Amino acid sequence: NFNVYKATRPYLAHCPDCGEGHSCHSPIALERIRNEATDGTLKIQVSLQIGIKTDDSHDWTKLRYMDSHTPADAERAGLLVRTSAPCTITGTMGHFILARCPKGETLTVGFTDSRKISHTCTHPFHHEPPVIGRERFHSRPQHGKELPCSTYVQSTAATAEEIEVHMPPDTPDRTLMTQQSGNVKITVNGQTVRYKCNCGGSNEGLTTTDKVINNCKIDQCHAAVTNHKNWQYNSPLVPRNAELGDRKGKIHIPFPLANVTCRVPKARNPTVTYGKNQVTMLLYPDHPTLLSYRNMGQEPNYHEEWVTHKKEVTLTVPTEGLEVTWGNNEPYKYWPQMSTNGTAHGHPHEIILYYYELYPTMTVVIV
Amino acid sequence: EYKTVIPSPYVKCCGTAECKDKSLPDYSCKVFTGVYPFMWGGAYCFCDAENTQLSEAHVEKSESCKTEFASAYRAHTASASAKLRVLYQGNNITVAAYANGDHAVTVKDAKFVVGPMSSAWTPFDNKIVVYKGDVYNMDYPPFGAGRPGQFGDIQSRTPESKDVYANTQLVLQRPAAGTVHVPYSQAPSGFKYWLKERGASLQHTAPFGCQIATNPVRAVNCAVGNIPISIDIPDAAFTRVVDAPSVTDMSCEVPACTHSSDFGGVAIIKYTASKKGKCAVHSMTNAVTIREADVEVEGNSQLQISFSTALASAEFRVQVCSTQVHCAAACHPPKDHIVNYP
Amino acid sequence: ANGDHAVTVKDAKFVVGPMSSAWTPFDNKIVVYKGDVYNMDYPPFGAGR
Amino acid sequence: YEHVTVIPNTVGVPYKTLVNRPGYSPMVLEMELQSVTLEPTLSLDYITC
């Protein structure tokens, strides 16, 4: 049941910043980051195969990894993905890690193999989830608007995506030859070993047994265990099958995207007061939220800003009304009026203050 | 979003390999001579002196393009449509007609034709870009002329096409000493960058309070201009003047008047009706508006009407059942400066 | 031929238009049958003769 | 080098364009139209049958 990884090998790579001051050759080396979700989850291309045994079983508590031409087995609870904290791991399959993780400028992975060592390595990754709606926040709220967004689903056998798996080229190991005072002792360790020498007699060819090669040193020669019986995928950190283009293979990359609906927090409803012709408004923010306003006349006169602290601002309402929105909630309309005091039908002149209320700055000009 | 597929580098040991023109969008190849890569056991090939590295790279479409994408549309002219509620014969009827002037809809034998819009104003320009909910007026670069790192750096005609146009300024650099990897230069994404310096959408900046929704894209409640409406009312709805009650010697007293948005005018009209029946009360002066359509007259009783006006001293004539009544009112300014409804 | 389509062939960029004249043989209202189009002021929807 | 030219809207008429780049031999490009398509706005008002 979903076993297409039957002939791949969880290859070992070169990780370019393994911590502790310097890079290393490591099995854990991540290669490709996926961050195309809006909501803020991460999909990771790693150099391993997780949940599959050496006999290609559905043992979903172990993991395969290469070390020194050995596919060995460790266990699934040792993984730690981190940027600034332990990220919440969600989906583990093969070369594929799905996790959710807070704000951070890096990304590292690390875990304990079968020889109790936490191999860790990192990359720089400027991870920042984008804002949703109009709000910067912390946690998933009680109640909010339901906006469209995108996330990765945990299905496995999804087609319409491909990578090409193939034959590994070679692996040079200088842990084989020993100098017998001019000779070398090429071992084979039950494999197929290529040698190449600056040494007469046996200079070229392919050996299958242990050899003793006369009158020429270790560094005078070459030793490389030539695998043929399994598959690695084309990594940009691995040398090619060094003759031509890639041998054809087929691995679909699982956990595809989908639309989804996600909750965004509502605003806190602010407190308003009404002055002569214009409005005043104190806002109650708790996480940084933007606020915008326009009018509905000919021009928009559009203004906006983000706010973090509680502010009291004034806004001039014209005769064509005003519109202000704040948070995810409903846009507040407002409309002016024929004021609290003017000057009614009175024995003095007592119209002109009234004749400011309708039409300020004009029609006193015809007076 | 684009995806830069960089395959395994072709390491040509002690000889010089040459890459040929293999047609792919933004196809990049560079052969670096004198490279000395270090592997597990030292240099990967024994023949050390003349090694060269063939670096190959190409850009292709991401799978996310099927879900996450922005579309550039050309908007030219809009077909207007309106929903009208009519209190016809004491009942609320809803009609839905195209506000273009050539869509007659007959409901309960009453033919409705909303005319053409007096103003042809539209808040949308010729070029629109849509990302699911928000739409933007943006002068996107033409197809096949995109610039690197900006909106339109990667362009395809449809989400399922196979050929695509790309301008990402990908130039391959010489790899570092010993480490086997494929370095490549700067490659920012214009689509992923546009999502940050996007600015306010048209939903917030459009004048006249237009509310815009999508799926399909539409502008709702743009308060611009006026609209002509023609009603071909059938003849069964009408009643002759003689069949309607005759009312006479009507007088009006206004105990309270406030020129405001709310029900600020109250008028008590004393009348004498000849018989029982319905009547259409109507103000003949447009500066004052009555918010009641039908009144039941009985005889020597009184009716109460609510009116709204902007004039402080409203001297106006009201025609009820073809009979004229003069009403003289004086109205005071209200207490509140801001109402939330126009 | 709108002035909004750059086409690259053999590294040569071709951009064509926009058309100097905006004239069109079609009026606002047309009626199309199987293979024939007619310029006709057809009666509106719900007001047929 | 960007060359801007204007040709009349006549199909089946070959037009010659002279590209004169300083320091290079002049190049003549031959232009031939095949078709000019005008795709109008398709908004179905109604059908009759």
Next chain:
Amino acid sequence: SSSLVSESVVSLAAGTQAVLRCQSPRMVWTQDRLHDRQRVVHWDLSGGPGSQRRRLVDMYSAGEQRVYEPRDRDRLLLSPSAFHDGNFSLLIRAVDRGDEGVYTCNLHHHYCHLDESLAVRLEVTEDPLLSRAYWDGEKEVLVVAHGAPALMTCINRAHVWTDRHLEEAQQVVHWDRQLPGVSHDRADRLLDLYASGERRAYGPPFLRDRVSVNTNAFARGDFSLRIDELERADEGIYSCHLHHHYCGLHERRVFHLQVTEPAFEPPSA
């Protein structure tokens, strides 16, 4: 596909609002992951019809089995990875007279609200060579010697029981309409309802205004179609299609809506 639930003919008068009832406790889902992926396996003990079943041991998906009696600890055992291949078998380390009775292996899906059970009769004898497990026609019978272990096999290889992906995301309600004259397969889709909240209306805007579903549809499992201002263009054969593809529920209900008959009409089913 789908399975026919119930037929009715609906005759209503013009100007009224039709409400085509389509409710099912099996299409309920909520806009929160209210432990839908949580399943429970449990073994129960009874002693005939005149005894009370007792929950012995249960186990949540992605969890460890919990036994209720301290005496039975380390004695009644399940495979800790039971949910990988669906082997819910129970091994009794050492049996006594108090274990005699009918054991039921019960699988339960808290989201699908399905229960499945099998029975085994346990009787404790003294001779180990008479100890056997056989099928009496409807249940397994275990004869076990005192102090011997008893492995009662309970294997269910259905995909819902093994640790596959098991969250569908695409529970869906379809409202379909069959107009007069249109052949099958070419019926127009009226409404799409996804469990996630998405709704899709089809047709010109004048038609979309008249077709609606209640806003808490998946919250109550009520997807009843309300069409206001019944017109003759509302007549036809409507079908509500409930599809829960992963759990294998595929049902449809058929409603014959005709608007040509006053208040004298008799109801069907």
Next chain:
Amino acid sequence: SSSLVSESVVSLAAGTQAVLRCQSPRMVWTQDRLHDRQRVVHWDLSGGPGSQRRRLVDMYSAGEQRVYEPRDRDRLLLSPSAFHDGNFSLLIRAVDRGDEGVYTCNLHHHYCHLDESLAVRLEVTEDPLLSRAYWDGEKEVLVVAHGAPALMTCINRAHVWTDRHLEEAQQVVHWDRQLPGVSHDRADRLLDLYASGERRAYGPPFLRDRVSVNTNAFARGDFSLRIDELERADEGIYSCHLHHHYCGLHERRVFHLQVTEPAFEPPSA
């Protein structure tokens, strides 16, 4: 459910013109309906491997039987309405010694160019008690008394042979493209070729300008696509689909188009 005809992979160089071969003599048809509903029945008589066969009787669909021997006229009879129920049995009024041999019943449809035949060996005895009908393993053998009538049954009730609408009107050839990495069924429609001659192309102008089939494609039964100025968007899995829904012909050819190997290409299969 389409039967594969032949499968190949085609690799050609960029800048060249592709020719995607799709040929079939069984798809030949012309614009006219010139005797499309024409079937023929014919009975043949043979006498072992070392004698020459003679056509005895033939008959066109909706027509009357033609006899070649004047003595056998009004003696060898088929049902004149044989084509309505597929009862092509032959009644011979009176048998003689010269009639011994193997008779073959042949049905042929000229539009699908199908032929189907079965043999029955007739042997004429003198004693009626030796008369039997048996199946020897691959053909019926009829033993008939001299002068008796013989009903040789030939019944084929397949829809192509019975008298029913029997007019095709919609054979279609499809050209499909499955893009690299893109899975099947959501493949872009490239070309529709209708038996009437009409073709339907889909897509932007960059694709439509390069895809064509010769105008007498179905006339010659050669549907090879010639694509000028090969672009990378042409690479992929093409499928030519011949669909004759009525005659039960549903065939496709699949092409893996790769761009490599200018003159060094191995032509697959």
